[PDB]
């Protein structure tokens, strides 16, 4: 595939040199042609990107998204020279979908643990921000929402890489505990702060799923570290507790309830799979199950304030 | 007499006398019936811990679950689903307002081993699409056919747009077990539905349009052109309007004449949007745009006239 | 649902997506019914090529064969009769004015392994002698008994003369 993706890059560059010609000399038919050609590129890239999503190749998906941003850059300049609304509307719609897609891929990249793909995804997200910032003369709230998600992902990655450094160094379980413990604290405080300013339901759903994926990463790092069942208990309880109170902040609806439930209980199920793998005794299995069920109980009884 | 059989079942499951008494104490406080208690005995035979069953009983009462919703926990337990995952499915099904048939279809998705988040998102999708439980049962059959969860969402979104019956979704699961790709299953759904409609309404113009679409689709190396042409065939086979028939026949004839995939997609997309739409002035302007195209001296004028029509109708 | 289930049967027969779409193009042009399409699927399961089946369907329409004669095409196909000989047998019976029962007895002569020209001379003899279709069924049973076409013709000639 990469050869086709690079043909799109070459096409885009020829269009971009033609956009210099549109500044240096100018023609409506040239602007029309590069606009249409860039849409044809965008459709080619989108077609590859949907196939890459279905196949699960994140590297190709990120490459295709970056090419979609490269196309969006030239599209935005073409629209700026032409004074054109249709292209700017197309650009905002495409960029907003790309933001959602790259968010979902970035969640997946953190979930699979290849943080270099996540870093590349955030690089692309900065380029999406460059497009959005050029695109809107007016809207601040879209930028706030994107940047809040970015600040959350960055904070989660700062914890993730601090833990991964401890894991690479072979650090003692007590340091892994105190780092993870304060990681969950900082996640909670940042989520609480972000919850003051965000208001898009889909963004809130994203943000919660990100906090959940960050807790999941912390738990899986502790499992890769081979920690004691006492550590698995303490951290799982603190993690579910944080993820519950963050649910009590963010949750407002059946849609958010369903997410909170699915995430919390999946995280507890994954925790119980670590207890199964280490062979922890039945009282630990009961303790974790009770903590999980008491979270589900509290999620229902919080939800019953609204339902 | 029969209330003793629950104690016998729990004793055969190896539950101790004080645990049977404690479970009976909970069942008495909660007022739960002998078959709800039999479902608790089946969870005990599935190896679910007595102290977890106390939470399952409590939760069923605090939710106000009906006996069949309680019974579905035993099927999920014998499918190997955890007490907590059972609590997910039930707690969600309650706020979703699901009926026992939809809950039994969730138990079948549990027997298919689908992840609880994917089950709940599939249930949310079926709820938002306003579908009946047979669509959930057909989604479970697509799970038995091994179709990925967002491809189930594609097949549901397609079947909803196309007004198909649930047995077409069952036949899509049969095509999935035959190893056909989800895009090709969509093409087969489209073509077979267009011809099933043509068997109900065998008009010469319907037969010509459906044939010309199937021909153009069989000629095309591009599956966007296939899906456009076969969806246009479904819309024309449901239609009773001479303007839609003329517009679709002109677009298919122009697409059978032309050698450019872009003009082909423009003409078919314009005809599809005109057939989705319901405005006689848009239909008149589209028929005019097809005259302007067929009588054109320049292919760039074909492209820009069809673009202006598409970008007004979309 | 039924048309999608017929497509699933063509998928179980191993017919590719563009070949099903071409067979569906023929179904739309020729106005094929479900039992004619089921016969095309059974010709597919008998291993007749998609390109030949398109000629078989074209021929069945250009002849004006009825659905039971089209079903007999799949019976002759499962008997292993060559694709043009299916068309000859059906054409001959149709142009003689023979009925679906006589055609089914010709499919039984095909299952008995009788040569196509010998079937056609037997059908011509039964037609000229004015016999009922059970005489063709008896000719198939005499073929299963190993009696020669000359001796079947002698037995029918004797039975008619007496």
Numbering used by the authors:
A (entry chain L): 1 to 307
B (entry chain g): 1 to 314
C (entry chain m): 1 to 162
What does the paper say about this structure?
The internal structure of the oligomers is clearly resolved in cryo-EM reconstructions for the first three sizes and in ns-EM reconstruction of the largest size; the distance between the centre of mass of the tetramer component to the centre of mass of the trimer component across the different sizes is 7.9, 9.4, 11.3 and 11.7 nm respectively. Views down each of the three symmetry axes (twofold, threefold and fourfold) are clear for each size (except for the threefold view in the largest size) with slight rotational deviations of the fourfold cyclic component compared to the design model, whereas the rotation of the threefold cyclic component holding the THR remains unperturbed as designed.
Here we describe extendable linear, curved and angled protein building blocks, as well as inter-block interactions, that conform to specified geometric standards; assemblies designed using these blocks inherit their extendability and regular interaction surfaces, enabling them to be expanded or contracted by varying the number of modules, and reinforced with secondary struts. We construct twistless helix repeat (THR) protein blocks from identical straight α-helices (typically 2–4 helices in each unit); the length of the blocks can be varied simply by varying the number of repeat units. Restricting helical geometry to ideal straight helices with zero helical twist in principle considerably limits what types of structure could be built, but this is more than compensated by the great simplification of downstream material design, as illustrated below. Using X-ray crystallography and electron microscopy, we validate nanomaterial designs ranging from simple polygonal and circular oligomers that can be concentrically nested, up to large polyhedral nanocages and unbounded straight ‘train track’ assemblies with reconfigurable sizes and geometries that can be readily blueprinted.
